[PDB]
Design a protein around this ligand. Sequence first.
Ligand SMILES: CC1=C(C[C@@H](C)O)c2[nH]c3ccccc3c2C(=O)C1=O
Ligand SMILES: CC(C)=CCC[C@H](C)CCOP(=O)(O)OP(=O)(O)O
Ligand SMILES: [Mg+2]
Ligand SMILES: [Mg+2]
Length: 315
Amino acid sequence: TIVQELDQAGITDSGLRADYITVSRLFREIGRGRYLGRYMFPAAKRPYFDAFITFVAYVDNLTDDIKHSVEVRARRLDEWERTYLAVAKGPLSRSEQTDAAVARALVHTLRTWDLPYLRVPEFVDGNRKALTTYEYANDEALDEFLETVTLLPAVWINQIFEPRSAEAEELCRHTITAFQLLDFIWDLREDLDLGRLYLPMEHLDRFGVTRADLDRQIGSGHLTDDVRELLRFEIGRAKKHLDAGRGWPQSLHPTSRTFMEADIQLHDSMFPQLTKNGYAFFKTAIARTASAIARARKINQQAIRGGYRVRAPFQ
Ligand SMILES: CC1=C(C[C@@H](C)O)c2[nH]c3ccccc3c2C(=O)C1=O
Ligand SMILES: CC(C)=CCC[C@H](C)CCOP(=O)(O)OP(=O)(O)O
Ligand SMILES: [Mg+2]
Ligand SMILES: [Mg+2]
């Protein structure tokens, strides 16, 4: 339980403990599948994993609340950022209550791990900019999204994973880039329906494809050779990044390897789903997790018997 994990982490402040408890329950609500990854980490690290993942998912969710206007979503980002900065520098609606718990846990997590907690607004600004960006002219323009929304939190959580070599950050950047590019491809139909194109226009031009072509053909039952070749190209670009980043687990502390090995393997499993049966994925509309938890429990206890201990909390 989070209470025993907080005990093992040495987090004793009753106000802070309550915030980590709130965040852990929120984490479970934002997705049980992702929440279970916490059990691949040493018990005393799970409060930090909870707080960091919840922060990224919580803020990204503010940005992708497609029920509401871009103006409303922008206001929510401003609200969370104001609350974060108030906490960082030392009746409530439900969103105000969660904003504050997420912020308080995150500040403590970031300071515990020697991360630049005052730069969190750069991540929020990337999300604010993404709200009003519906197209990307080329790779350089898409990098404005990737280097703020995607990879800034990625290089931060890399430190929480306890890198053993300097190559870890580049492997982290390749791997999470591949994950993000696969998300764009997987979600192409939904994103197109929202008026957003995350495939750079230069790539479309290269294969003679228009945005209208994609809008009309994805989910239509058929694909022209040009559209299929564009999809093949984008899938191959994601594959190349994943292959370049695949050594990331070995560059991390042993207690972090099982989680990222499982996550890489999950994304590996997306490639045949996208392409099989002649790209049928684009024409029409638990076991791995249990095994990884089993493997992680062996590795983590080994590491403990070898003297491993999670660092002391910021206080
Ligand atoms: C640590 C991590 C991360 C890093 C994140 C916690 O900042 C991640 N970012 C993503 C963007 C799109 C699709 C997947 C990811 C992921 C992960 O799967 C992951 O494990
Ligand atoms: C999954 C993780 C460790 C952190 C969350 C980063 C981001 C939220 C994942 C994208 O996956 P996803 O749930 O599909 O978001 P999306 O709907 O596409 O904007
Ligand atoms: Mg998506
Ligand atoms: Mg998605």
